[PDB]
Amino acid sequence: MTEYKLVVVGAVGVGKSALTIQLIQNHFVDEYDPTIEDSYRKQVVIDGETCLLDILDTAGQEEYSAMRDQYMRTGEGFLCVFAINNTKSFEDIHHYREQIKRVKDSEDVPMVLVGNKSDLPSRTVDTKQAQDLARSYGIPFIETSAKTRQGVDDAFYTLVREIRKHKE
Numbered sequence: 001m002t003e004y005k006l007v008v009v010g011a012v013g014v015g016k017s018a019l020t021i022q023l024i025q026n027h028f029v030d031e032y033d034p035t036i037e038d039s040y041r042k043q044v045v046i047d048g049e050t051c052l053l054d055i056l057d058t059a060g061q062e063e064y065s066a067m068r069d070q071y072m073r074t075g076e077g078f079l080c081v082f083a084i085n086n087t088k089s090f091e092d093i094h095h096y097r098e099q100i101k102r103v104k105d106s107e108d109v110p111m112v113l114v115g116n117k118s119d120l121p122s123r124t125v126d127t128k129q130a131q132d133l134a135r136s137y138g139i140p141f142i143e144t145s146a147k148t149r150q151g152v153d154d155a156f157y158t159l160v161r162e163i164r165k166h167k168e
């Protein structure tokens with residue numbers, strides 16, 4: 001069984017724990033929790049083969065810069081998650097891209113863009129904006145709803161395939 005070390009980055013107000021709990025115990029936790037560092041490991045069957053996904057969640061708030069430049073080690077797969085109600089989280093993606101470009105030493109890397117809380121009526125970020133931005137980085141934009149659990153599985157399959165194809 002192969003272990004995929006993936007990291008989930010996001011801004012304040014997104015709730016990375018909402019994605020983990022929804023896949024772990026299939027439950028949407030509305031209660032916001034300041035997850036500083038949480039590693040969730042579960043056996044997920046992708047494409048028909050059972051693999052282990054090691055999802056590392058880190059503080060989405062800016063404070064521990066010392067740890068931010070230290071935890072970045074086993075970052076095989078990157079997962080950029082943002083909410084369509086906050087424009088800052090969407091514009092912050094560029095800043096992260098420039099950072100990942102350095103702490104990786106590679107022009108190409110398996111990355112995917114997922115839009116959470118798309119079922120929410122608070123649509124402040126247009127979908128075309130995400131598509132246009134995604135095309136610039138050269139990554140696929142996948143809509144994902146963790147509240148009603150839709151577009152979640154496909155978002156994993158796609159990313160896993162990207163890593164698999166990249167390595168092979």
Ligand SMILES: CC(=O)NCCc1c[nH]c2ccc(F)cc12
Nearest residue numbers: 005006007054056072073074075
């Ligand atoms: C740093 C350490 O001791 N453990 C983390 C292990 C890990 C799992 N998934 C990841 C994704 C990115 C990353 F940088 C690390 C991880």
